[PDB]
């Protein structure tokens, strides 16, 4: 072949923290199909918004929006338990089919994106260009979002563990733990990575007795 | 400057599933310092092995081993709760300092890696070469390890949720759930991604009542 049709830009979805998660890597030859199983951000979340993105930037907002759609009817569950499988299928005509399917309920919703949608050749080059021009800033944003996402996980896991602990947890421990949880929740509202890591650190320092009770409860 | 000293290969650690997690990206100009907060794979894990890797391959075994060391004295905790912060610092002399620090106990262990350690120029080119030659296989292995790691998370979270549920969980539900958990544990022993995803799917289909009880317990 003298020619290949290839993706000029990565393709994916917006995930928690406002980042782009790539399902199809830049310069993939089509037809191609990739899928990944995602889950929910919130306890008892009934729906997920599937925001389809084209671009090379870490921040979702910095990429091209190809469109979006929701999948609802998600049954009550703890965050991170539902299995929402997201498939990007680009066919021989260059049409992108995106689906989101709930493996519990079997419910599925799709968006179809025409071969001609997305960024034109100029904008593509502008995008490849900006992604190299901002590689460092994007890397910093990835580290921030990853830190906030971890701290959110610690926030929530710890709160569940406090509840499960009940009276097993000494009063002084609970005082120290909740004040650290409150401060971590606040730090998670900003974009100061150092701040988040300092509250996470505080929580690790004050939670030892709680870790031991939680480890024991499921031992 | 007519010259820059740059990393010819990515640098990182082996993490669960036998993958390389990069802390310092290929072609980073030094001095540079990056850190990431990791946690434990197992409930009540007392120590983490820090296996320092140089290379571009997804599989840890496919990279160059720069050495390794353990950090122990991790206090009893559920998997994923301890905060083990891992820092790669390359100084002006090109010496790599790797540390692992437990944010609960403050305990820290280090390895120092000489500028001359790692792959020689030949082997570097062999490595850049193999990583492009195996890009597709490495991508497949990443998808497998990511799937097994998710399924392990579902396995373990679900088992905890069963215990916390107690008699709230109907007998027929518990029968279906445990048989699916057993089958998922078995699938997680292999390297058949389809198999793992099929057991995960089974668990999502049979766990609805359990998700609802768990969502309610912390509502």
């Amino acid at each position: 072949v003298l020619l290949l049709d290839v993706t000029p830009l990565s393709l994916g979805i917006e995930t928690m923290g406002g980042v782009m998660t790539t399902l199809i890597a830049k310069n993939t030859t089509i037809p191609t199909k990739h899928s990944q199983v995602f889950s929910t951000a919130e306890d008892n979340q009934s729906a997920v918004t599937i925001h389809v993105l084209q671009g090379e930037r870490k921040r979702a907002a910095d990429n091209k929006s190809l469109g979006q759609f929701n999948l609802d009817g998600i049954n009550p569950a703890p965050r991170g338990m539902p299995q929402i499988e997201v498939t990007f299928d680009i066919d021989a005509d260059g049409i992108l089919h995106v689906s989101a399917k709930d493996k519990n309920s079997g419910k599925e919703q799709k968006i179809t994106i025409k071969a001609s949608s997305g960024l034109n050749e100029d904008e593509i080059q502008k995008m490849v260009r900006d992604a190299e021009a901002n590689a460092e800033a994007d890397r910093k944003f990835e580290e921030l979002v990853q830190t906030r996402n971890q701290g959110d996980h610690l926030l929530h896991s710890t709160r569940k563990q406090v509840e499960e602990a009940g009276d097993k947890l000494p009063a002084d421990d609970k005082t120290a733990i909740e004040s650290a949880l409150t401060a971590l929740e606040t730090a998670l509202k900003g974009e100061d990575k150092a701040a988040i890591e300092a509250k996470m650190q505080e929580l690790a320092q004050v939670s030892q007795k709680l870790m031991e009770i939680a480890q024991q409860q499921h031992a | 400057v007519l010259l820059l000293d740059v990393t010819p290969l990515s640098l990182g650690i082996e993490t669960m599933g036998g993958v390389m997690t990069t802390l310092i990206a290929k072609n980073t100009t030094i001095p540079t310092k990056h850190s990431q907060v990791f946690s434990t794979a197992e409930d009540n894990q007392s120590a983490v092995t820090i296996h320092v890797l140089q290379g571009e391959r997804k599989r840890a075994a496919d990279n160059k081993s720069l050495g390794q060391f353990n950090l122990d004295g991790i206090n009893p905790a559920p998997r994923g709760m301890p905060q083990i912060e891992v820092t790669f610092d390359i100084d002006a002399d090109g010496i790599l300092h790797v540390s692992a620090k437990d944010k609960n106990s403050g305990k820290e262990q280090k390895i120092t890696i000489k500028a001359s350690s790692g792959l020689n120029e030949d082997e570097i080119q062999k490595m850049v070469r193999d990583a492009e030659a195996n890009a597709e296989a490495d991508r497949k292995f990443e998808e497998l390890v990511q799937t097994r790691n998710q399924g392990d998370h579902l396995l373990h979270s679900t088992r905890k949720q069963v215990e916390e549920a107690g008699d709230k969980l109907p007998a027929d539900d518990k029968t279906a759930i445990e048989s699916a958990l057993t089958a998922l544990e078995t699938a997680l022993k292999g390297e058949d991604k389809a198999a793992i995803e099929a057991k995960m799917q089974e668990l999502a289909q049979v766990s609805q009542k359990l998700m609802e009880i768990a969502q309610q317990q912390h509502a």
Binding site: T15, S39, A41, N70 | -
Partner: peptide
């Protein structure tokens, strides 16, 4: 798994 926010 990576998480997706609600609508």
């Amino acid at each position: 798994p990576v998480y997706i926010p609600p609508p």
